[PDB]
């Protein structure tokens, strides 16, 4: 097992929702893109050889669009308890997640020509709620969404509430640009009607 640390990256509503119907309920454009910059961002020197990994419960994979997977330009991993066939062409199914690392340590040693940078998790609800209890997950990238859609799937733990916040710390702005590397709008967006912002959440191991 592990070595590095875990990031979770979520977009949900001020009252933790994140879907509805086996779908994230709105039409982002920009904020989809954002996801896109972080889960497949590796520096210069090390996006030579280094490559992200994006972890997903299969829900999740289900929920994507034919069209847009297996996710390029990363490592595409989906926790199922019952791996039985996995459809993909080099996509690897994991038992859970303490298998998921197992797996790609295995897998991305020392007989590889790609190496692994950073780990992000995905996704879904229950995907999340295993990602918050493991010893590794230490950054949640959040993207808030301020406005309350129905949704019927909501995040498992209220980390920017008042219970939390001696352990999940919001990080200033220029850190999460520093982080993700490409400097990021800073105060709320709007996009077709609805209002956000990025976030970057951080606990001690
Ligand atoms: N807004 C956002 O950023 C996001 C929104 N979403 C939304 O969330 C929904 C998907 O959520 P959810 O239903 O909770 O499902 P998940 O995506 O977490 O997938 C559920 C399946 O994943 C497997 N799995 C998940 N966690 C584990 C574990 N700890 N051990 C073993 N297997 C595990 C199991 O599969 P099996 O049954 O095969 O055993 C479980 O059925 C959709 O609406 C999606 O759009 C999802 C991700 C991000
Ligand atoms: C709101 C997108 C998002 N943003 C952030 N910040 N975190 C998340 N976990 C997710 C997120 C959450 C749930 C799903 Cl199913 C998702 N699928 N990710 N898709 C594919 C995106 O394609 C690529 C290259 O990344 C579905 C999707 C497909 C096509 C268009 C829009 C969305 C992405």
Not at 17 to 45: A, C, D, Q
Request: aromatic residues 12%; charged residues 25%.
């Amino acid at each position: 097992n592990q070595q590095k640390s875990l990031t979770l990256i979520v977009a949900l509503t001020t009252s933790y929702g994140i879907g509805r119907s086996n779908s994230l309920p709105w039409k982002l454009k920009k904020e989809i893109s954002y996801f896109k910059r972080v889960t497949s961002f590796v520096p210069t020197f090390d996006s030579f050889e280094s490559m992200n990994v994006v972890l997903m419960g299969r829900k999740t994979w289900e929920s994507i669009p034919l069209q847009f997977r297996p996710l390029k330009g990363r490592i595409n991993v989906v926790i199922t308890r019952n791996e039985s066939l996995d459809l993909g062409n080099g996509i690897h199914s994991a038992k859970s997640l303490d298998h998921a690392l197992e797996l790609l340590y295995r897998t991305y040693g020392s007989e590889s020509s790609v190496q692994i940078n950073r780990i992000f998790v995905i996704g879904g609800a229950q995907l999340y709620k295993a990602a918050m209890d493991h010893p590794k997950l230490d950054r949640i990238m959040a993207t808030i969404i301020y406005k309350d859609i129905h949704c019927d799937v909501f995040f498992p733990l209220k980390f920017r509430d008042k219970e939390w916040s001696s352990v999940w710390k919001k990080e200033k702005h220029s850190d999460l640009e520093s982080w993700v590397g490409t400097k990021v709008p800073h105060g709320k967006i709007n996009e077709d009607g609805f209002d956000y912002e990025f976030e970057m959440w951080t606990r001690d191991l």
